[PDB]
Amino acid sequence: DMYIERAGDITWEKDAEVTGNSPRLDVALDESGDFSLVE
Amino acid sequence: GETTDGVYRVMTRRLLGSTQVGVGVMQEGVFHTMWHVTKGAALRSGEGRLDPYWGDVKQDLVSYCGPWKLDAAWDGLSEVQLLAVPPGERAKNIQTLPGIFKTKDGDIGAVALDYPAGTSGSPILDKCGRVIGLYGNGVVIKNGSYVSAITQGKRE
């Protein structure tokens, strides 16, 4: 029986690390909920 | 058990030691995770049990104790944060501006922040600390890095 443990308040941080890009990917989705790229 | 709002770790002992299989969001007495993290199974909190209420393998979403409660949406412009919860590590905000999943049915926000699959279910937030979706369903790109949809459910 899988169990959960608490981890924090749901908060935006002022002065948090700003990384990560913004790509435009062409995507599909299968009936089993798996995304795939469409070139 | 614990019904306080916030982010939780989803753990199992059905392997070596205690293993974090994913993450979730407790809000308005409903636990929200990704389907691939629990496969629809019941959860323990304290000696209390959480039973699945709603799920969809195609959305890859599942709610416990009540219907899906999170209705906020990426505005299409503003930066967001992956309030990530990696396995063995403290909760950590990682800020970014979302890119785009383009599909026949419509366009979806995405994030290119790679992390252990055990972070699956970590909540993505807007500037007001509203959950606009969950991290951990997307695609491996040419690079070899992972890009995740901002997966959000529908509130009835």
Ligand SMILES: Cn1cc(NC(=O)c2cccc3ncccc23)cn1
């Ligand atoms: C069955 N299934 C599994 C997933 N998601 C993943 O495995 C996954 C989630 C988050 C980050 C990742 N990074 C690298 C590689 C995978 C991941 C979605 N569906």
